Design a protein around this ligand. Sequence first.
Ligand SMILES: CC1=C(/C=C/C(C)=C/C=C/C(C)=C/C=C/C=C(C)/C=C/C=C(C)/C=C/C2=C(C)C(=O)CCC2(C)C)C(C)(C)CCC1
Length: 305
Amino acid sequence: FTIDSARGIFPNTLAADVVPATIARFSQLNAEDQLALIWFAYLEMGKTLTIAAPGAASMQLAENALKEIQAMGPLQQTQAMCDLANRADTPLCRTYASWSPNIKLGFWYRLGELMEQGFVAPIPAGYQLSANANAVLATIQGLESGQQITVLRNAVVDMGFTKRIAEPVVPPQDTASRTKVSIEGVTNATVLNYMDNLNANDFDTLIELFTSDGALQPPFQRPIVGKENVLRFFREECQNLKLIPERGVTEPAEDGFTQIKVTGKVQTPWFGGNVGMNIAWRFLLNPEGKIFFVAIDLLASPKEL
Ligand SMILES: CC1=C(/C=C/C(C)=C/C=C/C(C)=C/C=C/C=C(C)/C=C/C=C(C)/C=C/C2=C(C)C(=O)CCC2(C)C)C(C)(C)CCC1
């Protein structure tokens, strides 16, 4: 088999494909409506969910771009934001596209604060969304919180126009303070070491669990193939997560492989314990126990656990 055919293991797993569906609809909207829709979603979400502050290093990396926008007149500030949403080719859009997701998120977090305070051009008073935009926002507001925050993050990541700029790599958790996960039905050492090393930010140990040609598929993304690319992804995008696997099932696969499905919850440091995303992991292990393929799926509902 191939990496691409391994994408088919456990085909009964119902992923929350409403998320990429909603992003596709969002992406069709007029840029000002995209910005207003997210503003509306963010303000209403903020009534029950508090977003964690961006990290200090992230803010320093975005500081020069933020200062440039803040110095513009209001019409130019709005144009710059529309440029990002339209994916226009401008210097600002190219800088934005060089950033990791967390830096992009912290950039918009700060702009949102400044818009609330009146120091950056706000969405116009009394703005009404287009017919298509209003329906997109309705869909978002009917989703589970874990799906709502995934829509927002994906919309942020998709902006700008395509070096790589990321936050510094955090030191792994010291061994004496690490916790160990417990998974009903699953004692497989590779799966357990995967969860535990990711929870400890121990990416150098984590990557050694993979085959040389192995791949990791994040939710609604294509597989990331090979140790170099997977390790880069861990270091740039996978810091400070909390994986809470609950239960799993283990089955033989072709050629002496083993396939394992685990379900549980994951927390992002942007929301902490206030949002638990419903997640499945689908592992395909070679005869020596190395990870040939692992897919991480956002599940359609808690009924998929
Ligand atoms: C834009 C915009 C605005 C600002 C919007 C802002 C500020 C939005 C902020 C949104 C945030 C902060 C969203 C954060 C979402 C984080 C998520 C959804 C993380 C999910 C991570 C997962 C599921 C990890 C899963 C993994 C596992 C478990 C593995 O085993 C391997 C690795 C990996 C695959 C990664 C304003 C308002 C101004 C209006 C104008 C436009």
